[PDB]
Design a protein around this ligand. Structure first.
Ligand code: FAD
Ligand code: STE
Ligand code: STE
Length: 561
């Protein structure tokens, strides 16, 4: 009906991070007709624009509300795995932390055309940085907005940096400068524009919407890719399960580009008969291409946390004191600094200072620390954000304190995504696989992370401010007690890469080639976090945008690869 008698040179499945970038580059010269299909709504919520309102996006109608299969190894728990559901995708709902990891992470892919020397200039092309001048590591011209966070907690941010130095860490002035070693303490830059979320809808898609060759449908859930093997286009509903199934057709030479993210791309490819035959057979799905790797190599960065209250003399100095009054009302001072100056607590996603640490002489840091100048009231950091949102207007005072989140940033465990039913509107079968690596390296990383965070809090610099420890608490002393606390509290830092991994020729574990072309289908590609062979250290948004920029340069003939 909206797609009736139309032919497309590109159909983008999903309108998320990578999709927004491609919708921009692919529709640029005007020759090519581009369709974007997004299950979620338009990007208009105020909870998207204001960074601190990330607290409200968790477990909201703008999230997929995904829960994992029971995890035997995690105290028999289902794990929440947040994913954005709207134009912009997870760039619209994330913590805005701007990280690339280290050159070593790209060299460790071992995929021809995709070394550190190859990807660098693509990071730079994407970026306008407010706080680093232009050079080999920073752009001044690209659609992304990157800045130093516009909120500083003068007492607790200073205390954390002094504490990190006190325990023997060196400062890193730029976690994204590949001439520096990745390890050290300092500030995480954010994907913000003077304290407004700079998601890839705002930066890439929204400025080019008036282009006549670009069509974008929202509330448009893709149920499968129509394949003949050669991609014909895709099927979708414009009213969810109980809505008419339409179909969208490629023009001659046209391609379907999968941009439904490391969770939904493999789910859709499987419902499209691409992935392991046995999984397909289980639900009477015809096998079009039998690929081992579809839904495999799920890499996510797991987290735990410590948290401590401030001494009574420091009541009122926390970010929670800057955002909420003693009755849980948003402070009129916070709203004013935000709207008049793009300053203050509402510009914060909380977790934008920290460190990369080697717990045991690894080639690259295994541990990322995110310091928060506010106290966790749930050992699950993501649950704490949900409760912080739900706390508003409850007539209660959030206690002043700090959190350190510990993230296994180069993890050795892998998980999977597959099918629980034949209904393409059914939640996928999600297994994060945290703490399954055979050497128990990921648990070792987080356990040593807890020891590190306790040394930092017991430092003279943080001892000044802190009064005891709430999580894990003085009950948790031995390494076995620490590991048990981790099993019970472990949560996502919300990466998720690797589920349609790219590989060299003659790697049967791979799903796409170095050109992002799906093995044994013609005119079908994947351009999202699915393709990352081995997850880099740090949050995964900037690497997705770098892959999208390079994919678009490839598709429009401006570069090889
Ligand atoms: C809560 C959270 C916090 C994060 N924090 C950070 C951080 O601070 N910094 C950072 O760099 N990274 C962060 N990340 C990760 C980062 O946001 C993602 O890695 C990146 O945005 C992935 O982009 P993508 O295009 O691969 O997927 P997405 O951006 O998730 O795009 C997938 C899109 O496909 C849509 N879709 C799914 N199924 C269908 C269907 N059937 N039909 C149509 N559309 C469909 C989804 O609704 C979504 O809009 C965070 C992630 C989350 C979820
Ligand atoms: C706890 C999470 C904080 C949520 C922030 C709520 C802010 C309340 C202000 C409501 C009215 C003023 C709106 C000002 C700006 C709204 C969006 C924008 O245009 O940037
Ligand atoms: C915004 C103010 C929050 C106050 C509550 C403090 C509790 C801290 C919990 C730990 C941080 C959770 C981060 C969730 C966002 C995901 C980002 C990431 O870790 O990559």
């Amino acid at each position: 009906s909206p797609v009736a008698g139309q032919k497309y040179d590109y159909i983008l499945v999903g309108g998320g991070t990578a999709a927004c970038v491609l919708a921009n580059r692919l529709s640029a010269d005007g020759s090519k007709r581009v369709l974007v299909l997004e299950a979620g709504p338009d990007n208009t919520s105020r909870d998207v624009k204001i960074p601190a309102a990330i607290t409200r996006l968790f477990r909201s109608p703008l999230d997929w509300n995904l829960f994992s299969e029971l995890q035997e190894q995690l105290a028999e728990r289902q794990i929440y795995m947040a994913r954005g559901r709207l134009l912009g995708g997870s760039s619209a709902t994330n913590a805005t932390l701007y990280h690339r990891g280290a050159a070593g992470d790209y060299d460790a892919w071992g995929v021809e055309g995709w070394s550190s020397e190859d990807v660098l200039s693509w990071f730079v092309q994407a970026e306008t940085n407010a706080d680093f001048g232009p050079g080999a590591y920073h752009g001044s011209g690209g659609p992304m907005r990157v800045e130093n966070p516009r909120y500083t907690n003068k007492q607790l941010h200073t205390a954390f940096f002094k504490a990190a130095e006190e325990v023997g860490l060196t400062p890193n002035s730029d976690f994204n400068d590949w001439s520096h070693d990745h390890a050290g303490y300092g500030t995480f830059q954010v994907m913000q524009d003077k304290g407004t979320r700079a998601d890839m809808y705002r930066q890439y898609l929204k400025p080019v919407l008036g282009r006549r060759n670009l069509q974008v449908l929202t509330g448009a859930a893709v149920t499968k890719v129509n394949i003949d093997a050669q991609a014909l286009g895709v099927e979708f509903s414009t009213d969810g399960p109980t809505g008419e199934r339409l179909s969208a057709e490629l023009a001659p030479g046209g391609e379907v580009i999968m941009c439904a993210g490391a969770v939904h791309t493999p789910f859709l490819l499987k419902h499209s008969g691409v992935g392991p035959s046995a999984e397909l057979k289980e639900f009477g799905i015809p096998v079009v291409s039998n690929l081992a790797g579809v839904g495999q190599n799920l890499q996510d960065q797991p987290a735990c946390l410590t948290a401590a209250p401030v001494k009574e003399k420091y009541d009122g100095i926390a970010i929670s004191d800057h955002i909420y009054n003693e009755k849980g009302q948003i402070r009129k001072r916070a709203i004013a600094s935000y709207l008049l100056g793009g300053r203050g607590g509402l510009t914060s996603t909380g977790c934008d200072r920290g460190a990369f640490v080697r717990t045991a002489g690894q080639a690259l840091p295994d541990l990322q620390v995110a310091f928060v100048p506010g106290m966790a009231l749930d050992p699950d950091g993501v649950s704490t954000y949900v409760r912080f949102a739900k706390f508003q207007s409850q007539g209660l005072k959030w206690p002043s304190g700090i959190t350190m989140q510990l993230i296994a940033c180069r993890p050795q465990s892998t998980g999977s995504v597959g099918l629980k039913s034949a209904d393409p509107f059914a939640p996928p079968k999600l297994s994060p696989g945290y703490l399954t690596d055979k050497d128990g390296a990921d648990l070792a990383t987080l356990r040593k992370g807890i020891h590190w965070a306790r040394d930092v809090a017991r430092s003279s610099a943080l001892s000044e401010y802190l009064d005891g420890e709430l999580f894990p608490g003085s009950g948790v002393v031995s390494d076995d007690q620490i590991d048990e606390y981790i099993r019970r509290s472990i949560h996502s830092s919300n990466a998720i890469t690797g589920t349609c991994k790219m590989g060299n020729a003659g790697d049967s574990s791979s799903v796409v080639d170095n050109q992002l072309r799906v093995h044994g289908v013609e005119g079908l590609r994947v351009v999202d976090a699915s393709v990352v062979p081995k997850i880099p250290g740090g949050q995964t948004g900037a690497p997705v945008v770098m892959i999208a920029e390079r994919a678009a340069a490839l598709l429009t003939g401006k570069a090889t690869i």
